[model samples]
Target: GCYFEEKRYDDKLLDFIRYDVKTPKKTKYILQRPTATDEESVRLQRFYQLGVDLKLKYSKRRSLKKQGRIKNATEELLRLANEQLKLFNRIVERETNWIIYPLWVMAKQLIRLANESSELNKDSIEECGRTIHRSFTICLNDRNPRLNENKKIGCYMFANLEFSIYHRLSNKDMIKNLVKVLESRVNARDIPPLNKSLAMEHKSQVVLYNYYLGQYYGCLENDHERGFFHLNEALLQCPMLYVESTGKFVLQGQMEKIMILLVPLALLTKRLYPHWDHPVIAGVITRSKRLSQVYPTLVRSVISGNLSLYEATAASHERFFLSQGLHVVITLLREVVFTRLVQRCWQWGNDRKSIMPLKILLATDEEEQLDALECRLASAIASGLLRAYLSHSNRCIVFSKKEPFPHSK
Candidate 1:
């Protein structure tokens, strides 16, 4: 009789039931007893519990240790997980509280479910990407920490989805927005200082993230300066672990990737910053035996003031350059080539007579010499490579006499 009475009056058991009560029911009681703080606690607790339930469902689904997998059972669990995910999304939209950590977890779980298994249906895979994208936005838009590890993971997964599963994905505005979102974070200056633990833990991922950002900006967006900036950061932080086969500490593949970009960027931007011909970079140029064989020749053509060699190198390497998607960069280098020639011509004129006839400038072994020289001189003048205007009447390029291109710096 005493045991029955004690069990009936157990407050601890009642407390467990109370904590598990539905949000609406809990709110109904809160309305009778006025408590704002209590109500906020109830909301947070409810979402936290729901998050736990979703996690449990994913774990149980993954841990179904039967002789052979039961198809019906797996489908039923996936359906349940999806249903819970919908509720999670609703709560996320409704609640202003800091709840992104759990959402990131749920999104990652779905990513694993959709990707790791070949048996998952197409609809399930698409839904996984959609939910991941939505959750990624939530993580970035809200009080997601500046140094949050999972936020970086979310970015990596989203990039993978775009690159791998949907290679032909189009939607310019969507892609632009995603790129800008990452740009804002990558360019932020006021994040907390990097702690040793964080750096040690995140070294590889951070380098890869910067690499992707650099490639996107440089290759796709055509923002050469910003692309170089990110790539430079990644390379600067890259470690030089020794390779036994190569018998030298190199950046491995990253060195080559960075050089491939740095070559074009060097021609387009300020002269290849310090270390343009560092051993690592030169090594890649010599070792790469394919289309990249044009590297050393292209660089020499730019630095040397020889217009003929520049033209010949570009023509002979056209197939190689175009195949590697570097034709645009080489086209930009044509401007560089012309600029070099203008500088050389100026120096030659200043050394002897301050004025020279267009005949001397047009003197080339090529068949169409005078016409090609006039066209190049006209282009150079228009592009601000030569500050002086072309003297068509005089049939010559007049030296600026002071300093060509006031905006040279």
Candidate 2:
């Protein structure tokens, strides 16, 4: 400051500040000021043009970070998510008149959107750390007898955040907390028995949750046998019988396909753990035709444009019936066919049963089947297939192995 003062208040300091300021009057008005000379106007235009060009080029790299095509896409998404949230906040603030919802609703949704992003983007421990920290803050700060409504909102915020944490992070501590939530929120008298419709409505989150718990106990806690306990719980949640056309069992058209798949998937998981048996493999191999016959009939009701049942039937039968070595090829068949089946079902109604069969199929003890899954996955990766299967399968395997699913307990 003294140097500037001694140097006759160098105009350069003001120029530098102007250069640094993102929003400045001269900078903003330079182009619009009609009183300026043509030469001066051209110079200002050039200056702004250069800035715009450089910004556009720089922004291209920023856009690349969000493509989710790179190796650390999940990581990158988490990293930049805050910036995006800020952008959202700014837009909402600037255009308050244009939004459909009130500011409070938008704020609540912003928080929820952040949570979903965190769930999909962050790893387990990182997620847990964030959740635990937030929980402490929310619990302590929002405590007030007079402000019970705010406290309730705070509690909801905590519960939602806690669900994400408990969903991803596990152990006795996490599981105990999760059980507490279930017991608190769900009453035995209030809710009826688990069924196909419930499974579809929940999109099989219950089954996935059970699987997560199973992995947590079995793999993480060193109790493989007890893991299947949770998986069984998931299976028991399904309807007693399955109807192909609507995934209805015991006269419930509301039953979803995913619920249908969960029963088999949970059963199949029993075979995968500890070891593999050829005879056990043979049973699945032998039953392949029947299973195929059933699933296509089940899927056709949801499919469109003539729903080629015969083609699907032939494809399913041929897939599992391939050679012993090709028996592993059934994995690929499941990968391609069942995934397509689910996609078709989702287009119709996003039913859970449509998606469940293949996931259950993957749980089988067949080595060839597993290998086929791997092959198809690798192919999908190389081909840049953006369908849900590749990423979904990858997440399924990881969460299946890592989380504590009650079904697998």
Candidate 3:
């Protein structure tokens, strides 16, 4: 007996949702709402109804599932899936106005739903993502992809959220193709007018792309330098704190996201570590919540080059490190820390000599035996962290007199 008309369609929230375009009407006008009283307003209102239905279904599923009402949960899930297809079709059809904002809103909710649903419906989210991915391509590959700014508006929105899907699902390699396509397509072969110009117009979504691709390159491709560059761009591009159209200060949340990834990548790529008392660290902590508990220990371990402490801290935060795919770099950094330990041993044992023998270090550093030093030294040498050669016969290290532990090549 109940239908949406029972609720107030004239609600101001729904009015703005249906009518407000993101473009500011004028600097002085707070927010200009286009009066949706004409023929086009019907389609816009219908679109809003569809979005409301899908969103309500998601919340109902969440509540029912939380109460262990499996039967009711499955009922809403099936209905939501059907409604999703309806919305997908609507998004695919040609509409060039604020009427399409609901598409972005509904897709954003689908992402939220993905995280909450059980395995029974996980495929729904991924498949839904593919359809959204399909929609973005349709928009871009239109007869004149660049010709309509509104048509091209969603490339970042789609790709950015798509990355969020793969990010949660742990499908790392899938991003490479998406990465290439997005970079080549309306990200438009990297031009001033096309890529940067469009990027500026969609700063919010593009900022997220920079953060995801940054983490992707560093974590997957082992290219932290390239990754860090993009991440730094994200840090600068996203607002640290501000009120937005939602009349909320969620911009700081975005700032926090960039900082979390940036902090670790800074150490690995630039060999920089945070000093807690430093102004920059102070500023970041002020903008975001306090830095992650593990990072301070992480910074200490890396800067001081304490192998045991670093190894222990990483092990302690194994779940966190594993969750973020950070364990990979944390493991690789062990070699660098080992180099530090070796450097310390060499400094104490050198007695100002360019040639260092294992027997001497074994005596001074009694805890590590000859074979251990030799093995550690071999790895350190191979990584180019140490500029030296090991003489196995004499069991000595012959270092480049200029800089023994230079990060060569």
Top-TM-score candidate index: 3
Q: If ranked by TM-score, best first, what sequence of candidates would result?
A: 3, 1, 2
Which parts of model 2 have CA positions greater than 4 angstroms off? 1-200, 215-229, 236-409
For all candidates, the clash counts are 0, 32, 0
List the lowest-lDDT window of 10 residues for candidate 2: 95-104
Per-residue accuracy of model 1 over 91-207 as CA lDDT, tens digit each: 565443233334444554555555555753445556555655665554344444444332343344344334333322334455555667555664673222222222334366456
Candidate 3: pairs in clash: none
Best by lDDT: 3
Which scores higher on TM-score, 1 or 3? 3
Candidate 1 structure lDDT: 0.55
Segments in model 1 whose C-alpha atoms lie over 4 Å from true places? 1-128, 144-174, 184-201, 245-251, 273-277, 316-320, 349-356, 365-372, 405-409
Q: For model 2, how does the per-residue alpha-carbon lDDT over 1-409 read when each residue is reduced to its tens digit?
A: 2321132223333332222223333433223444336663443344434334332333353567446554354334333333332333333332212221121232333244345543544442453345333432333233333432222222222333344455443335765555444444335322222332123343344555555544444434534345556645544454456557754344232222222232223333332221123332222323444443454343342222223553455355554334211232223223333334334434444343323233443431565676676566446434322133333443232212222121222
lDDT ranking, best first: 3, 1, 2
lDDT of 3 by residue, 1-409 (tens): 0112222223233333322122233322112234557665444455555545544554454455346446555546544544554554454465442333445555665565455656744466656677667655645554543534345555566677788877666787888777767666644532232344444655787688788888887778777787778878877666545465654344667766666667777776667666677644555555443455667777777776687789898888788667666766787677777776667767765764778777765542343476678888888888677888888778888888888877523
Q: How many backbone clashes does candidate 3 have?
A: 0
- Worst 10-residue lDDT window for candidate 1 reads 1-10
Q: Give the TM-score of candidate 2.
A: 0.25
